[PDB]
Amino acid sequence: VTIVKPIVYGNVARYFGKKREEDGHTHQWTVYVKPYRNEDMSAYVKKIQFKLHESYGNPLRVVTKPPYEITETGWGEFEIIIKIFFIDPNERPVTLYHLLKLFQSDTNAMLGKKTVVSEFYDEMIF
């Protein structure tokens, strides 16, 4: 009948420990789309587009083969528009919106967590 493919999307980020003098960048981050289970999304995903902030060169980043990740460095938080394109042209692209998290919440800072993780769950239906 119907096919449901769970996914996780979001980002991870880590503070440099000091501001980089060359560009004022403070964090390294990775935005991603991953299958929840250990499997090959390229079977049904054509490409995943990650629209970054205007301060980034070539802000419309396209990933055609797994892993569907973009690693960059920066200093501020912004919204990333993630658009998932399917192999089947009859399947409308999936649009996700994700706020890039760089700064650790006081709760997680107190829990001694080193890296920021902002991950969300979704299910793609076919």
Task: Name the residues that contact ligand SJI, by CB under 6 A.
Answer: 53, 55-56, 74-79, 99
Residue 34 vs 98, nearer CB to ligand SJI: 98
Measured from the CB of residue 10, what is the shortest distance to ligand SJI in angstroms?
14
| Residue 42, helix vs strand vs coil | helix
Measured from the CB of residue 115, what is the shortest distance to ligand SJI in angstroms?
17
Query: The tokens 């999307």 sit on which residue?
Result: 9
Q: Is the dihedral of CA 63, 69, 72, 75 positive or negative?
A: positive
Residue 41 vs 82, nearer CB to ligand SJI: 82
Q: Is the dihedral of CA 63, 55, 82, 13 positive or negative?
A: positive
Measured from the CB of residue 46, what is the shortest distance to ligand SJI in angstroms?
28
